[PDB]
C-alpha cells in the first residue's frame, strides 16, 4: 500500500460487517463491550433486522446497582421519537442504565437527569456561552492551543512517533472547556484524570474499585465548591462565576447543584470530542481517499466532514430514559417506570435513514445523524464547541503533518456508554 511503512491496514470503504447471530449478542455483559467494532456493528445490524426493540439486563459494575433491565431502541426512528417526547421518555432519574442513588446524586444530579421546566431554567444559566456566535469568538483560542499541540508533537518526538490521544485529542478540548469554566491551567491535568475515571470506570486501565470512583467524585466536587466560593467573593468572566451568581426560581444554586453542574460540563467536554478526533484520524488512516479529498478542499468540505466523523465515531454510544406512561412501539408494549436505552451508535448505521451507511463519506449530505442525540430538550449543549474543536484539530494536522497516520490499532476503552480510544499511536514524515 502507499504511505508510511508502519501504517495500519487500510479498508475497503463501504463494506458492511457480517451480521452476528443473535445468540452471540449480550448487551448485558461487559465481555460483549470488549469485542471489536466490526462485531459490535454487526450485532446492532442483527438487532435492527430481527429485534429492533429488545430487552436486556443491566450490566453489573462494582459498587453500582444494576436494578431493572432496559428496552433497547436500535432503530433511528425510535431513537428520534423517544428523544422528542420527553413527557413520555423522562431523563429522571438517570441517563445511564444503572440506578441512581442518593450518594451518586450528590455529584451527578445535574440538569441532564432532570426534565423541564427545571432543566431549561438550569441550562439557561450557561446557554449563551455555547451559542454559535459566542463560540465562534474563541476560534483564536482553539487555534492557538491546537497549533501548539501539533507543533509539540513534532518537537517532543525526534523519532516522529506520538500518541494522538495524550498529545492532541485529549488536551485540546480539555484546555478549551477548562478555560471556559475558569479553572487555572495548573489544574487542567488533574481535572482530566478525574473525568477519565468518572467515564472510564470498569476498564482496568482506568479504575475498577468503587471506592476510587467515589474518591474521585468527592475530590472533583470539592474542587468545584472551592472554586465557586472564590468566584462568589471575586467575580471572573467565567462559567463558574455564572453558576454561583445565577438564580433559578428565585434561589441561588446549592453546593450540590453547583458541583453537579461543574462536573457535567467538564466531563462532557473532556470525554467526547477527544474520541471524535481520535476515531476521525483512525478513519482517515483506513480510508486515505477521504483524507485526500478533505485536504484538497479543507474549508469546502469541513462542514460535512466534521458531521461524518461524528456519525462514524458516535462518541456517546447510548443514553437512557425512563417511561412515565405505558407505550407501545413497533409492536412492543413497554410499561410506565421501565428503562429505555437509545442506541445512537445503531441509529447512525440504520439503512432505513442513511444511504450507504457503511461508507465513510466526508461529503455526505444530508447527514441527519444522532451523534449529538435525537434533538429536542437535551440536544448537546456543546455541539457548536465540539464541531469547532474537531475542525481546528484536523486543519492543524493537515497544515503541519498532512500524512499523519495511525501505526497501531487503537486501545479501546471498555465501556457501554462512551466509544473511547485510550491510545492511538501515529507517525508522520
Ligand atoms: C463530538 C463531541 C460530543 C458528542 C458526540 C456529544 C454527545 C452528546 C449527547 C448524545 C448528548 C445527549 C443528548 C440528548 O439527551 O438528547 C449530549 C448532551 C450534552 N452535552 Fe454533548 N457531546 C459532545 C461534546 C460536548 C462538549 C464539548 C460539551 C461541553 C461541555 C458537551 C456538553 C453537553 C451537555 C452539558 C449535555 C447535556 C445537555 C442537557 O441536558 O440539556 N458535549 N452530548
Ligand atoms: C457523555 C455526556 C454527554 C455527559 C456526561 C454525563 C455524566 C456526567 C454521567 C456521569 N455518570 C456518573 C456515573 N457514571 C459511570 C457509571 C455508569 C456508567 C458506566 C460506568 C459506571 C461509567 C460511568 C457511566
Ligand atoms: Mg511516545
Ligand atoms: Mg482562565
Residue numbers in the entry: 0 to 428
Paper's wording?
CYP124 (Rv2266, CYP124A1) has previously assigned activity towards methyl-branched lipids of isoprenoid origin, while CYP125 (Rv3545c, CYP125A1) and CYP142 (Rv3518c, CYP142A1) are involved in the cholesterol catabolism. Multiple substrates have been previously identified for CYP124, including cholesterol, vitamin D, their derivatives, and methyl-branched lipids.
A 1.25 Å crystal structure of the CYP124–SQ109 complex reveals two close conformations of SQ109, confirming the formation of a ω-terminal hydroxy product. The 2mFo−DFc composite omit map unambiguously shows SQ109 density in two conformations, which differ only in the ethylenediamine-adamantane part. At the same time, geranyl tails in both conformations are positioned above Fe in the typical geometry for ω- hydroxylation. Thus, CYP124 catalyzes the regio- and stereo-selective hydroxylation of SQ109. The geranyl tail is tightly enclosed in the narrow tunnel with a broadening to accommodate ω-5 methyl branching position (methyl at C3 of SQ109). In contrast, adamantane and ethylenediamine are positioned more freely in a wide cavity in the upper part of the binding pocket.
